Amino acid sequence: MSLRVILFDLDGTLIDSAKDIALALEKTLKELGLEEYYPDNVTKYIGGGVRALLEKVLKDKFREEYVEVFRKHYLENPVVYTKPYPEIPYTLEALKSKGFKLAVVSNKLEELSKKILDILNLSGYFDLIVGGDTFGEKKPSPTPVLKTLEILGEEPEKALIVGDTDADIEAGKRAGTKTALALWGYVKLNSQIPDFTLSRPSDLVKLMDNHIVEFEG
Numbered sequence: 001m002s003l004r005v006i007l008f009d010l011d012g013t014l015i016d017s018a019k020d021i022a023l024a025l026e027k028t029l030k031e032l033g034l035e036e037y038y039p040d041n042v043t044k045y046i047g048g049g050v051r052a053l054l055e056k057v058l059k060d061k062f063r064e065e066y067v068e069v070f071r072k073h074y075l076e077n078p079v080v081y082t083k084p085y086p087e088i089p090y091t092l093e094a095l096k097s098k099g100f101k102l103a104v105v106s107n108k109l110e111e112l113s114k115k116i117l118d119i120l121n122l123s124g125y126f127d128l129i130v131g132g133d134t135f136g137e138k139k140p141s142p143t144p145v146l147k148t149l150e151i152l153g154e155e156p157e158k159a160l161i162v163g164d165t166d167a168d169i170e171a172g173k174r175a176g177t178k179t180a181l182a183l184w185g186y187v188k189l190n191s192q193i194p195d196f197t198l199s200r201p202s203d204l205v206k207l208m209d210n211h212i213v214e215f216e217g
Contacts, residue, residue, distance in 0.1 A: 001212065001214070002158065002216040003100070003178065003214070003215065003216060004154050004155075004159070005100060005102070005149065005159045006095060006100050006102050006103075006161075006162060006204075007102075007103045007104070007105045007148060007149075007159060007160070007161050007162070007177075008102070008104050008162045009104075009105070009106050009161075009162065009163030009164065009165065009168050010104055010113055011047065011106065011186075012046055012182075012185035013085075013163050013164050013168075014104065014117075014122070015082050015083065015085065015088075016082065016083055016085050017081075018042060018186060019082070020074070020077065020078070020080050021046060021053075021074070023077060023080060024073045024074035025038065025053075025057070026038060027073040027076075028054075028066065028069055028073055031073070032066065034058065034061060037057055037061065043186045044186075045057060047107075047164070047165045047167065047186065048165075048167065049132055050074075050107075050108075050109075052107075053070075054066050054067060071112070075112060078112055079115075079120065083120070084120055084122065085185075085201060086200075087202045088201050089122070090201070090202060090205075091201040092125040094202075094204075094205045094208070095204065095205070096125055098208060098215050099215045100215055101152055102125055102126050103126055103127055103130065104117070104126055104128075104130060105144050105161075106130070107131070107132040108131050109133055110129065110130065110131030110133055111131070112131070113130075113131045114129050127152060128148055128151060128152060130144055130147075130148050132144075142172070142174040144171075145159075145177065149175070156176040156177045157176060157177070157178075158216060159175075160179070160180055160196075160213070161175075161177050162182055162204070163180075163181070163182060163185075164181065164183070164185025165187055166187075166190055169190075169193075172194070178195045179194035179195050180194050180195060180197070180204070182198055182201075183198060184199065184200055
């Protein structure tokens with residue numbers, strides 16, 4: 001299978017950010033006096049963006065302006081506990097040296113995505129970092145995948161989308177790309193069937209070693 005470009009979700013795929021999301025949520029509920037809403041398992045709410053997170057956490061108490069509040073607090077501490085998943089740096093290095101173009105596409109705010117990857121020193125691996133706002137937060141799926149690919153000059157059929165959520169896989173399928181599930185992330189059950197299922201990041205590199213995936217000059 002011949003490919004040229006690999007696009008990664010961020011939270012729960014490249015980075016283990018749940019503790020820093022929890023820290024921002026905490027500061028958010030304190031600001032807003034909504035402490036009793038802090039949930040028992042925050043990682044259950046990670047994946048769909050800050051908006052989806054606050055909507056499931058606050059239910060009837062949700063207000064659109066709270067998104068800005070959360071983001072403000074997350075920006076005051078983008079990296080405290082957050083780290084790349086084990087084998088992430090290794091895996092990016094391997095892919096890039098085989099010649100793949102790499103990009104990040106996620107729901108996280110672009111500014112925050114770039115700040116986090118700078119602090120973790122991963123920015124270098126990526127040809128393009130794309131966040132929920134980059135092409136407009138209101139755009140329907142899979143526009144961000146498509147537009148990222150158009151920027152990179154590459155076709156969908158030559159791209160692989162890696163993410164831990166069924167929504168990542170579903171966007172790959174709408175765009176007509178190949179898809180891979182990242183099982184090391186936050187999602188405990190999945191109903192999408194991707195081309196590939198990865199239990200650890202270095203598994204990407206094994207598929208390359210077996211010529212199961214090859215880089216297309």
